Amino acid sequence: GLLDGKRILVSGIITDSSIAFHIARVAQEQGAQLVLTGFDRLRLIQRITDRLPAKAPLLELDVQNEEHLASLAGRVTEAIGAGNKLDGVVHSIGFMPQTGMGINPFFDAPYADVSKGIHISAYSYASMAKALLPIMNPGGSIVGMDFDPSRAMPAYNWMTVAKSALESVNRFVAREAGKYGVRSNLVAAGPIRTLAMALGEEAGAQIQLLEEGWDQRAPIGWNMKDATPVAKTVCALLSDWLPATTGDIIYADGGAHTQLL
Amino acid sequence: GLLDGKRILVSGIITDSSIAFHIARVAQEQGAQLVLTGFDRLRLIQRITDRLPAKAPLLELDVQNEEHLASLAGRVTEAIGAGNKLDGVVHSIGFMPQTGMGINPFFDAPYADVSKGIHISAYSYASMAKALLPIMNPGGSIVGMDFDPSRAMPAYNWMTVAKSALESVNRFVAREAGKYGVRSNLVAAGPIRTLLEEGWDQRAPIGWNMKDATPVAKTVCALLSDWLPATTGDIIYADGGAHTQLL
Amino acid sequence: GLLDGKRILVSGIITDSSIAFHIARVAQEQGAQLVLTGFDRLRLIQRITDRLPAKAPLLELDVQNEEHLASLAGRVTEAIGAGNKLDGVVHSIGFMPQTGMGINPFFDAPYADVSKGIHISAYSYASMAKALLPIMNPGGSIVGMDFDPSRAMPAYNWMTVAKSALESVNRFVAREAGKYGVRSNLVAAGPIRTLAGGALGEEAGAQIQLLEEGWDQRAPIGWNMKDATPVAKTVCALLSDWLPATTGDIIYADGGAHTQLL
Amino acid sequence: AGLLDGKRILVSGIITDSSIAFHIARVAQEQGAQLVLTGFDRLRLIQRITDRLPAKAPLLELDVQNEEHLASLAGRVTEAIGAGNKLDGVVHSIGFMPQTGMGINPFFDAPYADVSKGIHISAYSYASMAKALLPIMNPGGSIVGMDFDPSRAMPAYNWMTVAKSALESVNRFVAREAGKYGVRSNLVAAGPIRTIQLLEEGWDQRAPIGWNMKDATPVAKTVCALLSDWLPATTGDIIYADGGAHTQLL
């Protein structure tokens, strides 16, 4: 069991297609004891999380709510049992209003929308670490989800900016986590056909070119309908097998980003 | 001169130590016709800009004020004259509340403070391009100020995250600017004493003087010129070559 | 164990301080079945490899010898048994004459010396893959050792150039390995006190001390140069099935030093 | 009042009038630079090509694989520019890779002897030229080399990619040496030029300001900008004159 006896917090489950769902499933398969955090539709998330191989407490967490962050540690402790701490934290949270991601021109995203997206997608990574590092064990691991933002691309627009910011946040979180003997890293994954992944002919064709370029580039290929390789990479970072890796990005994209054509 | 007859907008002058002040001075020395944008203390900024070698109209621009952005192009046109356009735009705007940049712990910066900083330091680069690209000429150049955020460091804290965001914004602005025949780039400058640093002069193969902004100002002018015509969505490093050296 | 039943080739053992020795030890502890390759002093290497927790066949491999590479696959097959293939290959080979790595000025390294170093440290990664990919299994993993060469530094000189070339070789090897369902990655490690101060004199002794001490200061989780286990563990992670979508890439086992400025 | 007025510059790498070096030399001359040219192997043919440049320039023989040429190069340049005068700029536009390590030939089928000759000419020689010409270079000087972005693998480019990865590393070490003379060292990572169809086509779409492979002037202009006094704080670095394609995914 890769994660045998490890207590791990998993945020970001909304559907069974969610990257977090797959992380949670693989982590449980690998012996982990999870705590799950959900946003807004908690009774709907519970029906989904009931599909996971093992039972796990579900706690409410809106990263934009300062009360949820202030009480999160006390609530996790109550769930895992007093005297027990977390060995891992998984941030699989992202959000960008349609104005900043999709068909809307780059220049037409109002800052209020961009700011909500950066708050949820990038700032919250620090918010979660701030809240959960006091209840984390030495040898611990914080993992976040990334989509390589080193180059501009169509449609992604302001979410590309939020990922650029998240990569910077990660590096600063590693400085803090280090003080606790905790590692902080991001998994930069290739495109995964979640429920969200209708937009019209132009954008439908844009996502087809990205998805098709990914598999051509990827020397080992890229299956967008399979989230298991991503989930297994997060679990590798949660394990004890990458003990000298922190403030870094691990690419689970089939190698696509290392190839030009 | 390097920018003879070029009409260039320069934002970010507050003191004579400001990076923008040096860009403006070197650009004027190189034949550029300037339009200057100031923020908040406009009568004070006019006292300071009067110190440059040539006269230049001063316009108010608060990047957080949507009215200023909506009228900016019409106000620049009025200043340079109807029928004339900008050949260059310089973004030398940055801000981060003390909670997000300095001795305050990284985790203690409230998001409202971080958001104001990202708005001013990163989002505004797109706001200025959106406002000024319709009144820009083919062959034009938009330049922004950067401080290499690729690796974390002490104190820079949330301003590093704003810089990381600005680098991403610049790559997207280049896609838009490109439709107008305009280049968009950032100058990742070394530390400058304008109103962390010592290792820079050692690391830099050609050295680094923090008390001198002229090498940074010159690089911005090179990017504003016609001598880097195939460079866009990129970062030019004017830091004495420190970022390429480990020790 | 992490590598239970996996047949893995490990090159680069010369002493028990060797990074490869630690990879081999951790891999055996994790259930791997090993084949070991040695250079020049085979009787010497056999004495060291006898210290590993399990017995493993030792084969001769000089990466500059074309006969050694041409017969390597047939020799590995003979050792693991016909009908069996490798699930992993570990390249822990590096060399740079004193002329190009150390106190000697950068400009004073003759090309013949630079070329031998690039041959051993960078070209050989492709040579090993060319030789061992026909006898590798889908799901396989080739791992190479790296030292972050993205920025220049004192004394590393031409070995930085060899690492810069090796990083490029790896990306091309991933294109080839990919056709076999094999991944190809590098572990960019922080400095480790292997067998290979005072020897270089005052000036350079102090230079390598600042470089080495900068790693623990920069690394948010610290850096112990007297410990190869974290590096060995990362190689094993790359050899496992837990990074299945990572290829042509570099994994940094440096305490996170390369992500920090100061 | 040209960009490079009165600057004495060495330009290596002219073989045809399609050569990137030919365009650097032409735009440098147009900008006031006094040039010294170095040629390889077919020197009488290289003289026929340089006679097409705007101004007269001495032509010297330089085979980067020849140790005698490198050892005498400085003395020969000094003789050409005049005793008491030094170089303000050096341009390395030299590259070579046998067909075994670049093209349709499988990556694994390139023998090391071929790879080594290519790395010698394309990467090591950048340090060889600096070693030879830095003693005869002025403070404020500039050494520029030609690059093709090797940060990601691609088809055909094969071992040449590895040579450019090595050259980028050599450039960073040359900056440490050049720095002692008050000299900068940089590379121009240029987009593709006709001096492969997917490279050449994919480039103009991705590049926000477009990319014309039939035009070397934008590349020549960037080299001249690096040779000028307008990038005085840039060393050990790479300037991308590629239309901006490398900053773009699609």
Ligand SMILES: NC(=O)c1ccc[n+]([C@@H]2O[C@H](COP(=O)([O-])OP(=O)(O)OC[C@H]3O[C@@H](n4cnc5c(N)ncnc54)[C@H](O)[C@@H]3O)[C@@H](O)[C@H]2O)c1
């Ligand atoms: N789907 C892909 O192709 C892909 C690729 C790379 C990276 N990612 C990243 O993976 C992560 C998860 O994406 P996914 O594709 O699994 O999508 P998803 O829609 O299943 O999950 C995003 C999650 O964020 C949560 N969330 C939104 N606002 C929140 C708030 N205020 N507080 C707390 N939680 C909030 C949502 O409820 C949801 O659970 C994101 O960071 C995303 O950017 C996705």
Ligand SMILES: NC(=O)c1ccc[n+]([C@@H]2O[C@H](COP(=O)([O-])OP(=O)(O)OC[C@H]3O[C@@H](n4cnc5c(N)ncnc54)[C@H](O)[C@@H]3O)[C@@H](O)[C@H]2O)c1
């Ligand atoms: N100072 C350095 O060492 C250094 C190094 C690299 C990059 N930079 C960057 O260079 C730029 C200029 O900084 P500086 O060092 O000249 O300092 P500064 O104090 O002179 O400049 C910052 C400018 O931003 C302006 N500004 C702030 N909020 C604004 C708003 N809402 N609307 C309009 N203008 C606003 C200020 O008035 C000022 O003119 C910044 O973007 C900074 O991040 C600075």
Ligand SMILES: NC(=O)c1ccc[n+]([C@@H]2O[C@H](COP(=O)([O-])OP(=O)(O)OC[C@H]3O[C@@H](n4cnc5c(N)ncnc54)[C@H](O)[C@@H]3O)[C@@H](O)[C@H]2O)c1
């Ligand atoms: N020691 C460090 O601090 C450090 C840091 C990062 C990377 N590395 C890398 O780790 C790898 C192994 O080095 P190490 O530190 O364990 O030292 P080492 O001396 O044990 O390893 C180098 C190995 O290369 C072998 N070798 C040399 N020439 C050969 C040839 N022609 N054919 C076959 N094998 C040959 C040697 O016999 C030796 O086993 C190298 O690639 C090195 O660059 C070392």
Ligand SMILES: NC(=O)c1ccc[n+]([C@@H]2O[C@H](COP(=O)([O-])OP(=O)(O)OC[C@H]3O[C@@H](n4cnc5c(N)ncnc54)[C@H](O)[C@@H]3O)[C@@H](O)[C@H]2O)c1
């Ligand atoms: N053409 C492109 O698409 C392109 C793009 C980016 C970079 N480059 C680089 O630009 C440089 C010049 O290439 P080019 O496209 O102008 O073609 P080219 O063939 O005209 O230039 C290469 C030059 O190197 C010289 N040379 C070769 N071996 C030599 C030796 N042993 N000693 C001395 N000189 C020697 C040749 O004589 C020739 O003049 C190369 O470094 C190349 O990699 C080319």
Ligand SMILES: Cc1cc(=O)c(-c2ccccc2)c(C)[nH]1
């Ligand atoms: C390829 C890709 C990357 C992402 O980050 C997201 C994403 C963005 C916001 C919220 C959730 C996922 C999507 C849908 N696709």
Ligand SMILES: Cc1cc(=O)c(-c2ccccc2)c(C)[nH]1
């Ligand atoms: C080294 C350095 C980098 C910067 O970005 C700024 C800066 C930050 C906000 C506003 C103005 C300048 C400073 C003062 N120094």
Ligand SMILES: Cc1cc(=O)c(-c2ccccc2)c(C)[nH]1
């Ligand atoms: C820090 C470091 C990096 C290296 O690559 C080697 C090395 C160089 C050549 C051969 C073997 C190891 C050493 C000793 N140290």
Ligand SMILES: Cc1cc(=O)c(-c2ccccc2)c(C)[nH]1
């Ligand atoms: C795109 C591109 C890159 C290069 O390096 C060369 C090249 C290779 C060897 C010698 C000269 C140029 C060419 C022709 N094209």
